[PDB]
Every structure is written in C-alpha cells, then in structure tokens.
Write a protein that binds this DNA or RNA. Structure first.
Ligand SMILES: [Mg+2]
Ligand SMILES: [Mg+2]
Ligand SMILES: [Mg+2]
Ligand SMILES: [Mg+2]
Ligand SMILES: [Mg+2]
Ligand SMILES: [Mg+2]
Ligand SMILES: [Mg+2]
Ligand SMILES: [Mg+2]
Ligand SMILES: [Mg+2]
Ligand SMILES: [Mg+2]
Ligand SMILES: [Mg+2]
Ligand SMILES: [Mg+2]
Ligand SMILES: [Mg+2]
Ligand SMILES: [Mg+2]
Ligand SMILES: [Mg+2]
Ligand SMILES: [Mg+2]
Ligand SMILES: [Mg+2]
Ligand SMILES: [Mg+2]
Ligand SMILES: [Mg+2]
Ligand SMILES: [Mg+2]
Ligand SMILES: [Mg+2]
Ligand SMILES: [Mg+2]
Ligand SMILES: [Mg+2]
Ligand SMILES: [Mg+2]
Ligand SMILES: [Mg+2]
Ligand SMILES: [Mg+2]
Ligand SMILES: [Mg+2]
Ligand SMILES: [Mg+2]
Ligand SMILES: [Mg+2]
Ligand SMILES: [Mg+2]
Ligand SMILES: [Mg+2]
Ligand SMILES: [Mg+2]
Ligand SMILES: [Mg+2]
Ligand SMILES: [Mg+2]
Ligand SMILES: [Mg+2]
Ligand SMILES: [Mg+2]
Ligand SMILES: [Mg+2]
Ligand SMILES: [Mg+2]
Ligand SMILES: [Mg+2]
Ligand SMILES: [Mg+2]
Ligand SMILES: [Mg+2]
Ligand SMILES: [Mg+2]
Ligand SMILES: [Mg+2]
Ligand SMILES: [Mg+2]
Ligand SMILES: [Mg+2]
Ligand SMILES: [Mg+2]
Ligand SMILES: [Mg+2]
Ligand SMILES: [Mg+2]
Ligand SMILES: [Mg+2]
Ligand SMILES: [Mg+2]
Ligand SMILES: [Mg+2]
Ligand SMILES: [Mg+2]
Ligand SMILES: [Mg+2]
Ligand SMILES: [Mg+2]
Ligand SMILES: [Mg+2]
Ligand SMILES: [Mg+2]
Ligand SMILES: [Mg+2]
Ligand SMILES: [Mg+2]
Ligand SMILES: [Mg+2]
Ligand SMILES: [Mg+2]
Ligand SMILES: [Mg+2]
Ligand SMILES: [Mg+2]
Ligand SMILES: [Mg+2]
Ligand SMILES: [Mg+2]
Ligand SMILES: [Mg+2]
Ligand SMILES: [Mg+2]
Ligand SMILES: [Mg+2]
Ligand SMILES: [Mg+2]
Ligand SMILES: [Mg+2]
Ligand SMILES: [Mg+2]
Ligand SMILES: [Mg+2]
Ligand SMILES: [Mg+2]
Ligand SMILES: [Mg+2]
Ligand SMILES: [Mg+2]
Ligand SMILES: [Mg+2]
Ligand SMILES: [Mg+2]
Ligand SMILES: [Mg+2]
Ligand SMILES: [Mg+2]
Ligand SMILES: [Mg+2]
Ligand SMILES: [Mg+2]
Ligand SMILES: [Mg+2]
Ligand SMILES: [Mg+2]
Ligand SMILES: [Mg+2]
Ligand SMILES: [Mg+2]
Ligand SMILES: [Mg+2]
Ligand SMILES: [Mg+2]
Ligand SMILES: [Mg+2]
Ligand SMILES: [Mg+2]
Ligand SMILES: [Mg+2]
Ligand SMILES: [Mg+2]
Ligand SMILES: [Mg+2]
Ligand SMILES: [Mg+2]
Ligand SMILES: [Mg+2]
Ligand SMILES: [Mg+2]
Ligand SMILES: [Mg+2]
Ligand SMILES: [Mg+2]
Ligand SMILES: [Mg+2]
Ligand SMILES: [Mg+2]
Ligand SMILES: [Mg+2]
Ligand SMILES: [Mg+2]
Ligand SMILES: [Mg+2]
Ligand SMILES: [Mg+2]
Lengths: 273, 86
RNA sequence: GGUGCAUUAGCUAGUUGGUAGGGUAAUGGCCUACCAAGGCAACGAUGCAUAGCCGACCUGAGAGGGUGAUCGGCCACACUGG
RNA sequence: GAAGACUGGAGUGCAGAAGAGGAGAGUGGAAUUCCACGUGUAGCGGUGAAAUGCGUAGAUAUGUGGAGGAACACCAGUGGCGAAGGCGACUCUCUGGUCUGUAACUGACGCUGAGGCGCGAAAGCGUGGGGAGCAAACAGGAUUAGAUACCCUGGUAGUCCACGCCGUAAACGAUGAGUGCUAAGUGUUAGGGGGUUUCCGCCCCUUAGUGCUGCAGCUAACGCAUUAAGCACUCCGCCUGGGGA
RNA sequence: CCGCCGAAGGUGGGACAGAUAAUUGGGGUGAAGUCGUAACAAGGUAGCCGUAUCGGAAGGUGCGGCUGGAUCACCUCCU
RNA sequence: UACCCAUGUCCAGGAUGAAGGUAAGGUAAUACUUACUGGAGGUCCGAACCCACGCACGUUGAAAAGUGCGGGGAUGAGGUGU
RNA sequence: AGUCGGGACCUAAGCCGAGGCCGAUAGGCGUAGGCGAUGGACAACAGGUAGAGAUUCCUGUACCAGUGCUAAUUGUUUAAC
RNA sequence: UAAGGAACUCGGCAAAAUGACCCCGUAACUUCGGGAGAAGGGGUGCUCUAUUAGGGUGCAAGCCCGAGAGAGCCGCAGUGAAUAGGCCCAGGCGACUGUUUAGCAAAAACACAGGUCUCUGCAAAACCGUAAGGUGACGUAUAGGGGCUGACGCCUGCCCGGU
RNA sequence: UCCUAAGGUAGCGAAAUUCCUUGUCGGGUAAGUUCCGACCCGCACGAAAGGCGCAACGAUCUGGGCACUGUCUCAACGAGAG
C-alpha cells in the first residue's frame, strides 16, 4: 500500500512511502550478486557529460534473466525481493535442476507458483513464449527486439503492452507509450503486467531523500550569467527574451522534435504516440 | 446456506428430537448465516443491499437472545458458551 | 411541591467513603492525621439571568393565567467588609 | 408484580413460484466518429430566410477493411423488483428479500422508536485512467432599436471507469409507522381450491399486489372512498400572520 | 514577644457583558428619476426544484427531477 | 580551491515521545477510548568539531584576513584522513 | 627484529597495456595480463638497561614454517599418501 | 557609581538584565503535530528525629542509593563562587532544514519537496571526442534529457493578426 | 462612435510597485515625512517572470511595549598594559 506519515516535523509533513508488504525476504542470493561503482555522469575521459548525478547510497548488482531461454524445466517461485537498481521488484526462481536465477516480478506472482518457458507453456502470468504463440489481445511485458538477445521493451513497474495482430513474419504490438510497432514473431515475451503499480504515487517529501538516490541540485538557466546559458543575464528577474526557450547548448527545447529524419526503423512503426 | 447444511445445525441443537422452532435452534441457524455473510460482505465491499439483510439478522438474533435470558437464565448461559457469543 | 436559557455538557478534590482524635447543647468532613478513589449529571449536574416564601389578591363558566403593596406566619439585612 | 396454561400475533420447519433486487468476471449486434484504399464530379451542410463552416490539396455519396468509446432497437405492459434513491443486451460466480400452500415446531419471543449508526438522483471535489457522441464556459454567423439570449457552425471541463469525499432535490402519492372494522362493479400480475369437459376452454371461491368507477362517511371546496383524506387505539416527527429570513 | 487562619490592598494571565469608532455589507421604506421586461395566456424560449458556470440588471445555459402543462398522435382502463 | 570516485574514521551529556504492540473496555464484527510498552525525526537544549552574524582592537599588524567577548549547525543535503 | 609497520601474500578507485580498433605525423582508446592501501590474511610476552636503541640487545618462558639425525609404525602400482 | 531611566542615536549599536534543579500554571491562532521553556509565580542553607520509609548488592557480616515531613538555628543574601533562555504585540519577504561572493554583501538571492509543458521505442534522445570509445545505463516511457514555477489552501481570465 | 488579434477577468491597491506626496480620513504619541486600518484619480498591479492568503520556522527587514541599564543629562573614582 501507500503509507502516509504523520506531520511530526516540517520535513515529514508531505512524505509518503511504500510499506513493502509484498517483499518476502530481506537477504539477497549471494551467488547472483555483482559489484557496482558509481560514475556520477563522468565520461570515459573523466568529464561530466550528463549532469545532476552522483553521490547516493551504495548498491550492488543483481544479475537478472531477461532471455528466459530455459525451456521445459518447471521453475518454482521462491521469494520476492527488493532491487535498488530498478523500480520493479524481482522474484527468485529455483528450477528442478538446482539452478537459481532472478526474474522481474509480474503482477499477481506469488510464492509457490510454477513458471514455464518454451513452446508448450500455458498462457499464464509469468510464462515466457515466442510472440507467434501468443493469442491476440493478451497483455504482455518484457518484449525483446532481436531473437536470442533478451527482454528490453516493457520492463519498469506497472507497465504493460498488448498484442494487436499478425502480418506474417511480424506481430503488431501497442507499446506502453501508445505506439504501434512491428516486431518479429520469433521474439519472446512474458505474460502479464509488471509488478509494483503504486510506485508512481510516492511523495518524496525531503530534499535529502532525493540526495539519497543520487540526484544533485538543478539550477535554472535564468539565474546564470550570459556566458553560461542562453537565458542568463538581465537586471532583476528577466523573461525568456528570445524567440523560443533554449537548452544550455542552443537547440530549441520546447516542441522541437529530435528524432533522426532518415531512420532505418520508420518502416516498422505503424503509428506514433 | 445450503439446505442439508442447515439441517445438521437443527439436529445438533434440538431440545427434543422433533422441534424446529426452539430459541436454541433458531439462534444456532441464524449464527451460521451471519458467519457466512460476513465473508461475502468482506470481499464484496460495495454490496450495500445485501448488507442490509445482514443487519436484520443481527437484530432478529438479538431479540431472541433477550427473550431467552428473561425466561430461563440457565439455558441462556449454555448457548453462549457453546456458540461462542458474548 | 412551587423559574427562564442546551446558541450553557461535563462538574467536583475536604471532593466521596473508612479508621482515630479534636470541637459543639447535640449527630455529622464540622475540623485534623492516615487509607482508598471515589461522588453528581440528559429523571438536566454545572454555568448565566431573574426573584424573598406562603396564607392570600385580580381575572376566569371552569381548568388555568398574572401578582405577592396593605393584614398575619417564616426568613435575611441594619453605611460597606471581617 | 410473581407462579403456571393456551395459540388467532410473531418466528422456524416442509412443498412450490415469480422477479430490470445487489456486487464481481467475461462476451454480442446494430449505429455514430476517425483512419487507409478503389469508383466520381462540383457541390455539401444549415435555416422562418440566410450566413459562418467543409470541398478541386477532390468533398458529399459509395464499396472494402481497421481502431476506439458510450448506450442497450423489437420484447415493453397505470407490467415487475427494492426501505428510499433507483434497477432494461447475454452468460456464469457470490448474495438479500417477498408471495402461496401445509399445521410439524417455539409459545407473546410484539409495535413505535428521541439520541446513535448506515444508505442516499444530479451537479460538484481529490488522485490515476479513458475520451466515440453530447455539451456549461468560450469563439464565429444571423435575429434585434439593443441581444452578454432563443436559432446555426465549432468546442474545453464534465458525462464513462477505480478508490475516497460531499449529503442536497417539486428526494412527491406535496399523504409517518403498526393494527382492526366499514356496500358494490370491473381490468391486470404471482399462487391455491372446486365444478363442466379426454384435454383445452369456461364458471365460482380464495390469498398477496397493482389500476379505474362509485354507497355510507369525511371535507371550505376540489375531491378521498377496503391501496381512505371514513370509524378507532399505540408510538414518533412537525406547525401557530406576511416580510426581514 | 512569637505561630497558624484571616478582611481590605497590590501584581498577573484569562472569561463574560455593555457602549463607542474611520470605513464597510446586506435589509426596509419614499406617488412622480434612469435601464431593460424575468413571472402571470403556450407571457411570446412552458414553469419550478438542487447544483455548476457566465452576464450591467432582472436573468442565460448545461446535468438530473416534478406537473403545481392547454398542447400536438396509435394503444390501453372506466362510464 | 570546486565537483566526483574508492577505502577508513569522529560526533560528552540531557529532553521530547511518531508508527507499531499488549491489556482492559465498546461492538454482530469493526471503528473508538484508556493505561502500559515502543523508540521515529534533514526533532529540541548543549560541549568537542565545523562555520563566520554584531561590536571592539589591530591596520610600516603577533597575522599579506587574525584576536577578545557574545553568535549559528551540532544523526545529517554532516565533519574529516589517505 | 623469523614474531612490530612495509616487500618476497591479496585485491578497490585509478594507471599501464602483447595482439587489436581508430587516426595528417605525433598519437587516442582498449582485451588477456599486470601494478596500485586508505581495506583483507598472517607466528612474543613480562622485566633489566645511570651518555645516547629496545616487543630489536640481555634474562625467563614461548609460538610459526622448514631441514637433517635417530626409534618404532604403516604402505608399495586393483595401489597408505 | 547619587537622582532620573532611551531624554542618546540613522537605529536600545554597546552594555545591563534572564539563566540550574523541583513544583503550580499557561492565550490568540493551527496544516491538530504545534504555538510552549508561551506568559506569570513558588521552593532551595545547616542541625535533630535518622545507619528513616523504602530500594541496589551479599549466605551473613556489611557497603551504596536517599523522598516526604515535622521541630529548630544563622545571615543583608542559602543553585551564597564559576558555568547555564530576556520576554510580549503587529506587519513585509521567503514555506521549512540547507547553500552563496577564500579576503567588504549570508540576504527577500540559489537549492528544495511539489506543479506543468516538451523531446525520447533503445545502436533512445541528450552530452564528450576528428574517429574508435564512452556517460545516459549493466537502465527501458511508473524510465531518461531540457525550459519555466516553487510546501500547503482557493484559483490561473481574453487574444493565434506578428514571431 | 473610431480602431484592433483582443481590449485586463477574479483578487489586490500611496504597495520591496504612487511622480505630484508629508494624498485624505482614523488609531497610536504631549508632539509621529516612519508604522497600522480604511478610500480608490493603479504617473506606471494582476494570474506558473504565477495572483491572493497561510500555522511552524528566520544571527532577515519594519513599527510599538515590560524589565533593565554610564547610551544620555554630566560626568567622578579605582585596577592593569602602553
Ligand atoms: Mg535533470
Ligand atoms: Mg529548479
Ligand atoms: Mg546572477
Ligand atoms: Mg549566448
Ligand atoms: Mg535573457
Ligand atoms: Mg537575472
Ligand atoms: Mg525589472
Ligand atoms: Mg427542592
Ligand atoms: Mg468519629
Ligand atoms: Mg463539606
Ligand atoms: Mg443550578
Ligand atoms: Mg375562557
Ligand atoms: Mg384558582
Ligand atoms: Mg412600603
Ligand atoms: Mg443608607
Ligand atoms: Mg403463521
Ligand atoms: Mg439480477
Ligand atoms: Mg445487478
Ligand atoms: Mg459495428
Ligand atoms: Mg428575408
Ligand atoms: Mg468515405
Ligand atoms: Mg415494496
Ligand atoms: Mg439469497
Ligand atoms: Mg435471488
Ligand atoms: Mg410482491
Ligand atoms: Mg404446547
Ligand atoms: Mg423500526
Ligand atoms: Mg436520529
Ligand atoms: Mg456524478
Ligand atoms: Mg473527477
Ligand atoms: Mg482526471
Ligand atoms: Mg455571439
Ligand atoms: Mg456539436
Ligand atoms: Mg463514487
Ligand atoms: Mg439549501
Ligand atoms: Mg429538504
Ligand atoms: Mg423521484
Ligand atoms: Mg416535503
Ligand atoms: Mg394509519
Ligand atoms: Mg389501514
Ligand atoms: Mg386488490
Ligand atoms: Mg411579526
Ligand atoms: Mg414572524
Ligand atoms: Mg416576459
Ligand atoms: Mg451562455
Ligand atoms: Mg431539463
Ligand atoms: Mg399549471
Ligand atoms: Mg565517495
Ligand atoms: Mg537536529
Ligand atoms: Mg535550531
Ligand atoms: Mg563558506
Ligand atoms: Mg558554540
Ligand atoms: Mg544546538
Ligand atoms: Mg627474540
Ligand atoms: Mg616483518
Ligand atoms: Mg605485514
Ligand atoms: Mg601496440
Ligand atoms: Mg590505455
Ligand atoms: Mg583486470
Ligand atoms: Mg601490492
Ligand atoms: Mg594499510
Ligand atoms: Mg601479526
Ligand atoms: Mg631516547
Ligand atoms: Mg621492552
Ligand atoms: Mg547611576
Ligand atoms: Mg540607584
Ligand atoms: Mg523604571
Ligand atoms: Mg521605551
Ligand atoms: Mg535628539
Ligand atoms: Mg530617523
Ligand atoms: Mg546588543
Ligand atoms: Mg530503613
Ligand atoms: Mg551560583
Ligand atoms: Mg550563568
Ligand atoms: Mg529561507
Ligand atoms: Mg566576503
Ligand atoms: Mg552510442
Ligand atoms: Mg558512438
Ligand atoms: Mg554503456
Ligand atoms: Mg500513467
Ligand atoms: Mg504552488
Ligand atoms: Mg522563482
Ligand atoms: Mg498548492
Ligand atoms: Mg495565463
Ligand atoms: Mg501564429
Ligand atoms: Mg495562423
Ligand atoms: Mg501615507
Ligand atoms: Mg509599508
Ligand atoms: Mg495621520
Ligand atoms: Mg524609520
Ligand atoms: Mg524612532
Ligand atoms: Mg497602509
Ligand atoms: Mg499593468
Ligand atoms: Mg509583474
Ligand atoms: Mg505569465
Ligand atoms: Mg512567488
Ligand atoms: Mg500577497
Ligand atoms: Mg500576505
Ligand atoms: Mg537557516
Ligand atoms: Mg524592533
Ligand atoms: Mg593605572
Ligand atoms: Mg606601564
């Protein structure tokens, strides 16, 4: 659920958070952990190329299975855990082999269920199938774009895509953004919606809470100097004294479309958002 | 409450092997019904028309309990310890 | 047994009861020490406003409504407090 | 008040019946709109008359296909269900109430009900979706002495969904709830009994609803009249000249 | 002489009641002033009730409801 | 010196009493009330530590930016070493 | 100074980088591999010391790794270790 | 430092004043947490009853902790020294904690949680670099970049001719 | 009636915005160019360069009180370093 906090202080006044009712265990699977090091937006050369990053709580990588290519082995859900590296939760699945791996937790996935992948899998929440074996109208997630590569298209918490038709070698999908797209029929997908739907209702409440997650402050361009930003300067507060609002590097920023005009995938996009 | 399920409760609380309208029998059956609606109302939260029927069972059950208490106290305290009431 | 307000909902701490003593013509938290946390209230506590009470007087077919000067009974007061 | 006894009140049992009563999940067909492609030429749309608007960048019309949302044609009925608000496509799951017959069972276990607790059309409010038609605000065109309107062309919130608020209405039968008594005539909904008849059908009686007409009675009158505004008993709510309000 | 209790007096923060005050808000009264004509007839767009928005003003419009509507057509019940 | 990365370390004492939990009440079950428990916070007062708000002195200074007396933060968007 | 801190032990950020990719020259980037503590592992304690060192020298009692020499034991290619 | 007590001055600047522990009591307003150490008051020393009543520790010896009271005693004064909040009424700006011109400006400036517009279907957009190679991200529209506004409450009107 | 794309809505208003200006009236003071409340003829307010409010917070700015004082009337004496 969503947990409101009592207004004891001025920083806890508007703050809300999840209660983590779905999470089952608090210890990760040791043999599936890899180290991460923060980069703070620093380049290959050490330059700050993407700004407003750096300096949060330290985390550790949990290696996830997006390919889902273990076919014919019944996999049993063991726990549902917390992942700092993504908005959705994850589920630990240990197969009849003895092997264990993490997957994205779908909506309604509970401990004790059995999960299948392949061609003979049933259409149930958690199973992985090729897009040609999925009937029209089902809600899927974790769509992959090239066969054998791994899930990539719908993966954040509460997101879902819907199968929409067939065109021989391709399948129509209505992506979460509202886009209709053509994807090969030999690419896989998982049935269901993605786990943690309430994630968008959280009110951060504090500036320090943004700092905990790795976000440095954002300075507006109107309070800079003329050599710093196309908006800086002027005596007092100044309007946007230009034809259009501008990014820190020129290149208008409001309404100006930035997709390449000679793209090679314009023939696979049926209708844009 | 299905018909055969009701007839087991009746047979389990009869003061003699023939009656079906003793206050002991009616309260036992009424108790079973409100312990079955409470699950329906719990999940079907916005079913207000059915919830009114619940409150007419609770009031009717309370009227019979009050009558039993005045007429014969010893019987009354036997039912509540057996049905788990207050 | 005899008044208005709920657009006045809580009031009380010697307050409620007990044990020992003091004091009074006399019983009593009347007073004191100890012990316990009680007592009153929607059958109207508390608070605000108004008022001496009655026999009786005026009116009324009666039931009631208004009043309490003169006469008689009781009470309180005696420039204002102790 | 106390001790017993009874079954005409009330309730249970047993056998049937009807119903758009409620909540959840899924599905269907007409129709409007938008999109893509054939055919085709100069208007379409609109009004009391017009104009704004759409159309040669090829519309309206027409044939084919796709997407999406909302309401459910005929059945349909002073018909049905619910305490009221209200409930109309189909199927399933979970649930509430009512009517009829029987006389097995308990044996007054009942009625009303200030405070209290719940439900409660539409508009409106908060958060997240959705958005085809309709449409406050708004824009343009007409009408008019003027027209912040009626009329026409567009159109945002809203109307739809989930959760949480709000607590009002000509929320009306302008008629509080319970009980008993007091001429008839005639439709209709759901049952039961009897006579005719092989059935069907016709007739009579009876229970619970739903309409119309009318006697006594009531009413200032209009009118009500076994579904009383008649005759009675119990409990609750409310009123005491108009404005201010 | 000392001690308790103790009227009046002083200090403090609240409670309640009246009067007064620049200005301001709605209300009422005044035959003759200005603007329009919302209601009563189908009152010239039927009216009214709750709500939302807009407009010099009566008021207009949307949503739901009522007849305390003469009305315009096939059927149903009573005489 | 500014920002960042990896790995260590520092913060005397005292005050307040969030969620949750238990028991007793209260209900058809809940809501709700009262006690006990519990130990949250860019919470509170205040040293070390960090900072630099006022005044005075210094101004060929003890010092090419300091000292004295008061002042702000002091479990965090914290200080600091390699 | 076998025992304390550091090498002959280990790795983080970072740095270098055979082949390799890129680029007027110079060179830039990067795989295997390797360096790199501020972290991980690892065997010694108490006294004495009158000019200057002490877990180091001296006294007493220890521990860690290894080597040879003796004495029994066991095993020998269905095979101790 | 007598008497006065802001008459000084741009301005109560500076100084003076309050200050510990225990008890009583406490307003408007409120986002119901606060305001609050609001305000305003009262008590503190020593002796005797007294190794107290009662607690911690121990097998006991013993040791440690120490409230209420009564009676007294002494000073001008009892937290007798040092250390230890002055408070109230009303308005402007910023919601709050935080950051800023090393060396004249600490603020009403910046940041912030929140709002909204817009770009991006993944070899994502955006950014560094001639390129290779990278950040974004070991992420995937509930995610990432940019512009403006800045908790919360009530609201956000008209104009698409010009750019 | 002329012009325009359209002619500023709610709210606020001598304001961190008002030249004239110490606007005019009221309060506070014995006396108030500053302060608070009203008015509206807004040189030259106005809705995300957001409009109007707002409990808690502030080494922020502004006006008024209690206490207190060598700040002052008006200065005097004493200690230490020059
Ligand atoms: Mg950013
Ligand atoms: Mg910003
Ligand atoms: Mg600047
Ligand atoms: Mg420039
Ligand atoms: Mg500029
Ligand atoms: Mg500027
Ligand atoms: Mg300016
Ligand atoms: Mg009396
Ligand atoms: Mg006695
Ligand atoms: Mg007494
Ligand atoms: Mg009284
Ligand atoms: Mg009379
Ligand atoms: Mg009389
Ligand atoms: Mg006299
Ligand atoms: Mg006199
Ligand atoms: Mg019966
Ligand atoms: Mg149904
Ligand atoms: Mg239904
Ligand atoms: Mg169709
Ligand atoms: Mg004409
Ligand atoms: Mg067509
Ligand atoms: Mg009914
Ligand atoms: Mg049922
Ligand atoms: Mg049913
Ligand atoms: Mg019926
Ligand atoms: Mg019998
Ligand atoms: Mg009732
Ligand atoms: Mg009531
Ligand atoms: Mg609605
Ligand atoms: Mg809404
Ligand atoms: Mg919405
Ligand atoms: Mg018009
Ligand atoms: Mg239209
Ligand atoms: Mg609702
Ligand atoms: Mg009203
Ligand atoms: Mg009403
Ligand atoms: Mg109705
Ligand atoms: Mg009425
Ligand atoms: Mg009646
Ligand atoms: Mg009747
Ligand atoms: Mg009938
Ligand atoms: Mg009157
Ligand atoms: Mg009156
Ligand atoms: Mg008219
Ligand atoms: Mg209009
Ligand atoms: Mg209507
Ligand atoms: Mg009429
Ligand atoms: Mg770091
Ligand atoms: Mg703090
Ligand atoms: Mg502070
Ligand atoms: Mg600094
Ligand atoms: Mg300090
Ligand atoms: Mg502090
Ligand atoms: Mg040695
Ligand atoms: Mg060594
Ligand atoms: Mg070492
Ligand atoms: Mg090379
Ligand atoms: Mg290199
Ligand atoms: Mg390496
Ligand atoms: Mg090394
Ligand atoms: Mg080291
Ligand atoms: Mg060692
Ligand atoms: Mg030495
Ligand atoms: Mg030594
Ligand atoms: Mg003096
Ligand atoms: Mg003096
Ligand atoms: Mg004085
Ligand atoms: Mg003064
Ligand atoms: Mg002067
Ligand atoms: Mg001055
Ligand atoms: Mg000062
Ligand atoms: Mg003792
Ligand atoms: Mg002292
Ligand atoms: Mg002090
Ligand atoms: Mg600030
Ligand atoms: Mg400076
Ligand atoms: Mg790239
Ligand atoms: Mg590249
Ligand atoms: Mg990368
Ligand atoms: Mg969304
Ligand atoms: Mg805001
Ligand atoms: Mg700003
Ligand atoms: Mg807000
Ligand atoms: Mg605007
Ligand atoms: Mg334009
Ligand atoms: Mg244009
Ligand atoms: Mg002035
Ligand atoms: Mg001012
Ligand atoms: Mg004046
Ligand atoms: Mg001044
Ligand atoms: Mg002054
Ligand atoms: Mg003023
Ligand atoms: Mg202006
Ligand atoms: Mg402005
Ligand atoms: Mg603007
Ligand atoms: Mg602002
Ligand atoms: Mg303001
Ligand atoms: Mg303000
Ligand atoms: Mg601060
Ligand atoms: Mg001041
Ligand atoms: Mg001297
Ligand atoms: Mg000297």
């Amino acid at each position: 659920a969503i947990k409101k906090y009592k207004p004891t202080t001025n920083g806890r006044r508007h703050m809300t958070s999840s209660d983590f009712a779905e999470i089952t265990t608090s210890t990760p699977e040791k043999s599936l952990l890899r180290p991460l090091k923060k980069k703070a937006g620093r380049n290959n050369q050490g330059k700050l190329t993407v700004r407003h990053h750096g300096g949060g709580h330290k985390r550790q990588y949990r290696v996830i299975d997006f390919k889902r290519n273990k076919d014919g082995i019944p996999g049993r859900v063991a726990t549902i855990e917390y992942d700092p590296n993504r908005s959705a939760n994850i589920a630990l699945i240990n197969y009849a082999d003895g092997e264990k791996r993490y997957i994205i937790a779908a909506k309604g996935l509970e401990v004790g269920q059995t999960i299948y992948s392949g061609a003979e899998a049933d259409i149930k929440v958690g199973n992985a199938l090729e897009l040609k074996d999925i009937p029209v109208g089902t809600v899927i997630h974790n769509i992959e774009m090239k066969p054998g590569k791994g899930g990539q298209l719908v993966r954040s918490a509460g997101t879902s895509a819907q199968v929409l038709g067939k065109e021989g070698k391709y399948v129509l999908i209505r992506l979460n953004s509202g886009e209709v797209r053509m994807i090969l029929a030999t690419c896989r997908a998982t049935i269901g919606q993605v786990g943690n739907e309430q994630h968008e209702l959280i009110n951060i409440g504090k500036a320090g809470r943004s700092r905990w997650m790795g976000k440095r402050p954002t300075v507006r361009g109107s309070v800079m100097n003329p050599n710093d930003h196309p908006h800086g300067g002027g005596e007092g507060k100044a309007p946007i004294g230009r034809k259009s609002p501008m990014s820190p590097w020129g290149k208008p920023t409001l309404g100006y479309k930035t997709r390449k005009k000679n793209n090679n995938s314009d023939k696979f996009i049926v209708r844009r958002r | 409450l299905t018909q055969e399920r009701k007839n087991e409760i009746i047979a389990e609380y009869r003061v003699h092997d023939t009656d079906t309208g003793s206050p002991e029998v009616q309260i036992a059956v009424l108790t079973a019904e409100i312990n079955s609606l409470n699950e329906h109302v719990r999940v079907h939260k916005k079913d207000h028309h059915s919830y009114r029927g619940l409150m007419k069972m609770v009031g009717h059950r309370r009227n019979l309990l009050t009558y039993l208490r005045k007429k014969d106290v010893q019987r009354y305290r036997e039912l509540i310890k057996r049905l788990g009431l207050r």
